[PDB]
Amino acid sequence: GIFGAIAGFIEGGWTGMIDGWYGYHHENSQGSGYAADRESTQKAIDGITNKVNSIINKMNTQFEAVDHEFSNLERRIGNLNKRMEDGFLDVWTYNAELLVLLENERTLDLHDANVKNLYEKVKSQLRDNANDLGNGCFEFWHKCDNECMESVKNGTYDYPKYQKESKLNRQGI
Amino acid sequence: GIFGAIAGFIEGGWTGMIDGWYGYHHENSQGSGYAADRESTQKAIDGITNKVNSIINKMNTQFEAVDHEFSNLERRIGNLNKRMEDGFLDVWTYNAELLVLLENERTLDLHDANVKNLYEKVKSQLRDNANDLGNGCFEFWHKCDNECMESVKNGTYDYPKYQKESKLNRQG
Amino acid sequence: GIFGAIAGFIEGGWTGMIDGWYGYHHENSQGSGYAADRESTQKAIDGITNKVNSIINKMNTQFEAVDHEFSNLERRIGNLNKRMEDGFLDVWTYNAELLVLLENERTLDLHDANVKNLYEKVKSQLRDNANDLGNGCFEFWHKCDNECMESVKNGTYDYPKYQKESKLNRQGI
Amino acid sequence: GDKICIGYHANNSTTQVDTLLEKNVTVTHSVELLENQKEKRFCKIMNKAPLDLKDCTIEGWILGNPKCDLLLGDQSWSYIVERPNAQNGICYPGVLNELEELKAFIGSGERVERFEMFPKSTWAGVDTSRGVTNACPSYTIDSSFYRNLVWIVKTDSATYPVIKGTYNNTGTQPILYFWGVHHPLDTTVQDNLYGSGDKYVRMGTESMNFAKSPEIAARPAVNDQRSRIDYYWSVLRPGETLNVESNGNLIAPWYAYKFVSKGAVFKSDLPIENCDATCQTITGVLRTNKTFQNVSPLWIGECPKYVKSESLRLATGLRNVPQIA
Amino acid sequence: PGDKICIGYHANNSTTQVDTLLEKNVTVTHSVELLENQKEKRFCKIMNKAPLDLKDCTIEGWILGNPKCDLLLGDQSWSYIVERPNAQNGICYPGVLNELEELKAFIGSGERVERFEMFPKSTWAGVDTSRGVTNACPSYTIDSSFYRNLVWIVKTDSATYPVIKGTYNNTGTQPILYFWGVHHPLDTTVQDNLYGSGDKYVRMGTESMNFAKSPEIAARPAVNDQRSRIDYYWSVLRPGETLNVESNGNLIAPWYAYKFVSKKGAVFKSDLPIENCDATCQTITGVLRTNKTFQNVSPLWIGECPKYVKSESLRLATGLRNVPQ
Amino acid sequence: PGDKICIGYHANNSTTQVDTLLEKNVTVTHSVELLENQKEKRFCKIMNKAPLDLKDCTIEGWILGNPKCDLLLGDQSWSYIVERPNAQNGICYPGVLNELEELKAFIGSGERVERFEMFPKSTWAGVDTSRGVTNACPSYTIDSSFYRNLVWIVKTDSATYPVIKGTYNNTGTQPILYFWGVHHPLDTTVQDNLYGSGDKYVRMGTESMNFAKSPEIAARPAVNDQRSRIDYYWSVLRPGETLNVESNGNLIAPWYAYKFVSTNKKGAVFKSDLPIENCDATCQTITGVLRTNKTFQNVSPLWIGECPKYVKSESLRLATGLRNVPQIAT
Ligand SMILES: CC(=O)N[C@@H]1[C@@H](O)[C@H](O[C@@H]2O[C@H](CO)[C@H](O)[C@H](O[C@]3(C(=O)O)C[C@H](O)[C@@H](NC(C)=O)[C@H]([C@H](O)[C@H](O)CO)O3)[C@H]2O)[C@@H](CO)O[C@H]1O
Ligand SMILES: *[C@@H]1O[C@H](CO)[C@@H](O)[C@H](O)[C@H]1NC(C)=O
Ligand SMILES: *[C@@H]1O[C@H](CO)[C@@H](O)[C@H](O)[C@H]1NC(C)=O
Ligand SMILES: *[C@@H]1O[C@H](CO)[C@@H](O)[C@H](O)[C@H]1NC(C)=O
């Protein structure tokens, strides 16, 4: 990754998660699954779309080459026309080939950063109530309800609520 | 936001922090306030400024159109000229408009990055002396004097000094 | 720096670490020294090398000026040839100059992200077994032979193994 | 215990993009921005069919070669297809002056209306009927001439008298007309067809002046002709007037086109079928919504930008790293 | 209950917006607008030098010496030229200024001309040099006049037109811009009345030049009651170059020429006022007084101007995303 | 003491800087210079084919066959042309070579030329070939001479200049570049003396070309002690085409012509005073040889061969390393 989440410390993707780009996977006594984060997937869709549309719009300007003929005394103005038309050709072929190599890089980075920020938005909520396993995955020191899993996602996690349950469990081992 | 801080976990900004781009809001028994971080602000200003001048300087050369006249036996080159002049017009209009669009995207992220690394700088200092709320705000497990606040900003925060007082209330 | 690692929270570089871009410094009862993180400098070397080759390739085309004589009844198309040729000379000068400025800003950020992600890798392994000094330095609350140092560098560090040892040593201070 | 994880999307996509840092990067969603596909035919643009000049070249069509009579009336085109191997052009050997400027001027137009600019009766005392060449056969007749010009010759009476005509363009539209100057190989041919003594051709408008006299010599046989004809074109602006005046060697304007004024002229093999188009290139139709094309720089209508790129695939999805079964 | 220090960022009463590749209409705390879209609709001095107002006269009218262009006559220096669109006084005696466009370009820059008598009427022995006027070219005072830079040379009352000759060796520093002509009558009667009988020629040479033209008598459509024509010519006698004239009749002689001194130069065809103001940027449609990098006013300018682009706005964010409470 | 593990980065003694959009003069550990400003001030063989050094002749002096250009006489082959800025020997008899800029462009883009005799002096009957010499055109050996590729045809002791005709048929495979002229005396005296009295003409034609010109007699400013002028002309007789020459007089006749092979490559003409040596090259700029691996150059926009893209830039240094913050020793 460059942010390091994608193809990085979070080793892989979820074919099982099919309703968004970025998401949560949970497991608890009531079940397990894969739930996409709608807000950070929407905001990335609006944004990538706008990028695509911005480039499309900027690129809707054509250079029109011409069919004109030239006599045996017009070699110089004829070659002047050829270099002109090949010049604007090389300039626009560059302008697109390079922009695509660049914008792809920055697009992959953009995703990598939205995974990373989702990972940090949870880690600053669980603190020591949860244990950090590998691959951006967390094991709670307490029992997490579905309505617990829900609060972690929508940002209304109740840390105090599970503080004493966690402590007793965390170093019982 | 891309680095998560601006219009992210720090939801809004402060119409009260007048002196800087990036800053601290504190609260105390002595009161609450706003205070910018000169180092990161003035280094950001320096950068943004140099970007603007790098752009302006690169864009200094013009393309000179001429409005020469052509005869009625000169339709080919008179058109060759027009395609040519609108050719460079179409390229430089693209270059400008695209640069501006890209650089605007990247500049907004720079400010996001700089607000994030401010939050990380404070977080690293405080450690377990303070509790990290969701919003880039920290609740102290002790009483923090205007001198204490000042030290967090200065980057000279004495962690052991308040450690024992903090261990108590953290568990009390 | 933008990720805050290079010339940021980590103040300086190591003239001592000669085998890599990013690395670890360790001090042991057994000894000290410098060792480059091998996985990461190779991914940075690949990535940057492709960037350089992509640029070089994209710039493969050349506009061609030609020296064609013009007569005193050919002032208008003489100047048409000049304004055209300079026109492309000014377009390519600007491309190569703005791109170098831009890509240079971005390649510094990439290096500065690999340092920050290296440090975040280690910091998430150590947890509270290690004390945090500044400059991206950790002091272990336990002993750490070379084998233990290696395990941190290799991403296979054992936190439970030394958790008890670290906790007591921490209590004492 | 209970686990909550954070992660990202994957799918069976095997589509790869490229990057400054990395090549051959598989991603989850992406958009191709370039069209490499092309109906290899010509179509109607703006619902206005092209003009197929068939076995005739542009010189042949518009000068009025007898073997191009298929093309003879008025014409409305959206572009012109000129088949490369067309063999009917300038049948009586000689140069059409400012050829390229005229192909350019004809290209700008969308319509021409043929009309009789100078009736044969305009020239008194001379023979309109006699002049035709074996170098310019019609399909039916071995000897004929351009349907837009009259090879005027002197009558049985020996003298060729000064002949004069005018045409006033009271019209709203410009007039494309042609004329020429015969250049016999001999002094013997000159005297047989035209009077004795120095001959001249002269024409003038408010904004023009022309003047030429026969250059008499044998050029190599072309179509069995060792003589030549200089052909000329010009455009009578609306409100302008043409005065013609010669004492010999004039190949006169007979018929001219009222001319209505981006357009193109395609040299091409491709068929013209009963089909519509919105973008036509010299190598095919582009029925596409893509932003770029690598098909051809030469088109008419609304087309995508032309580049030499084989692919321009943007990425819109994250790197595709699915679980390995 | 605990004391708190927060980290955050600036906000302000801003409503100014920008676009990014990823989002449109993003309000931002501090931005810079790089594009200039305002102008002073008028013409001002450049480098503290006033422009040349041809006024009622076209460029042709001015440098040939049209009788009605007398207020422009003499020395001129200019920072640029302003030719008005409906200027009526140009070529008064009908005919074609050959290489008109190329002459317009050479004049175009150009910064100053000094007018001097190149060939005095004393040259041309045995011909009348005082009867060459015409009702086509009136001055404001007189019904029949002629261009101030040429002499219309006519046969002495007692015939004929003899070989006349002149020369000029350029010892100065600056190139000389000069003009001449050949008369083309509608009859052989005008031709005879004004010049000798016989075959007439006009021949001009310099070290690097060759001219030769003889009359082409015919009747062109009436322009200013004239069915005769004059072909005008221009040239440039470089420093150190000698000019040899020799004619037989039909020569419109060079009387006055310009010492010509030559940066980037403009001819603006416009109707805008020239006011007593100064400027650093002049545009064909207005003045630009601005520090901005881009302008959207015009591609045609003289001076130090912003670069021209089609963009309505070019605004760079300097500040950050504005989210106030 | 307690066990430490630090995360950090490379530094080195490099003093090499780059600029970025945000910061100028940044020191970095590793970087590549992408632009080349070094050059060899000389001209070198390019496809193992040596250029053509016109030396003290101009382009016109060379193909007209000026006497003093005899060193260049005959067949020639080349990868580009070097013409010296102050070469003296060009058009020795004053007058215009017409469509010159277009001839220089045509000559460039031509890999080689074979010289041959297109029209032999016998071609013209009733006229004097051997008087056609001037002393505005000396050779190095004889004070009065004339171009090697043209005949100045003058008249014989009989007062009349007879009509003369010549035909050349291009049987095979190569364009032929050839020249001819029309003489313009300062006098009718000289006109009558050199050529027959009465109206004169030069007429020439091919399957695709027509030429007619008549003398323009007038006194012109002395150049090379000559007040007369010659109009010189050039043309290219395509394969399978035929030229007819016919003249009443005043014809400077084609004598020798060039079989012309055009090139598949970029043709070029360099007006330089740099030298030519026994060396090879891949890039030849007008101001020197580039021998480089880099992607850009600032040396010249004019070249033949494979070259870096030209830009005005002084330097183009891409960072490949990181910010270089080495430790402060004292
Ligand atoms: C006004 C004045 O005094 N000037 C001319 C004077 O220049 C000219 O004399 C010419 O003088 C030059 C150099 O002084 C040569 O001597 C000319 O002689 C030759 C020549 O070598 O060029 C001799 C040669 O044999 C001739 N060749 C042929 C084939 O004719 C040529 C040729 O005739 C001329 O070039 C034709 O223009 O000239 C000598 O002419 C005289 C001659 O009219 O006139 C003075 O007025
Ligand atoms: C040129 O040569 C060819 C081949 O011999 C011949 O057929 C042709 O007639 C020639 N052209 C002329 C006009 O002599
Ligand atoms: C470094 O700074 C100097 C002036 O201090 C400047 O001339 C140069 O362009 C800068 N960049 C490099 C490449 O050193
Ligand atoms: C032109 O004038 C200069 C200077 O007076 C002189 O040297 C040269 O001989 C003159 N040339 C002619 C043709 O008069």
Numbering used by the authors:
A (entry chain D), C (entry chain B): 1 to 173
B (entry chain F): 1 to 172
D (entry chain C): 2 to 262, 266 to 329
E (entry chain E): 1 to 262, 265 to 327
F (entry chain A): 1 to 330
Report text from the authors:
3′‐SLN binds in a cis conformation similar to its interaction in the wild‐type HA with slight changes in Gal‐2 and GlcNAc‐3 presumably to prevent a steric clash between the Gal‐2 6‐hydroxyl and the aliphatic part of Asp225. Consequently, the distance between the Asp225 main‐chain carbonyl, the Gal‐2 6‐hydroxyl, and the GlcNAc‐3 3‐hydroxyl is increased (from 2.6 Å and 3.2 Å, respectively, in the H6 HA wild‐type complex, to 4.6 Å and 3.8 Å in the mutant complex), reducing the hydrogen bond interactions between Gal‐2 and GlcNac‐3 of 3′‐SLN with the G225D mutant RBS. The G225D mutant lost all binding to avian‐type receptors and now specifically binds to human‐type receptors.
In June 2013, the first case of human infection with an avian H6N1 virus was reported in a Taiwanese woman. Previous human pandemics have largely been of avian origin and required a shift in receptor specificity from glycans with a sialic acid‐linked α2‐3 to galactose (avian‐type receptor) to α2‐6‐linked sialosides (human‐type receptor; Matrosovich et al, 2009). Through systematic introduction of mutations responsible for receptor specificity switching in other human influenza viruses, we found that a single G225D mutation in the human H6 HA strongly shifted receptor specificity from avian to human type. To examine the structural features that underlie the specificity switch of the H6 HA G225D mutant, we determined its crystal structure in both apo and complex form with human and avian receptor analogs.
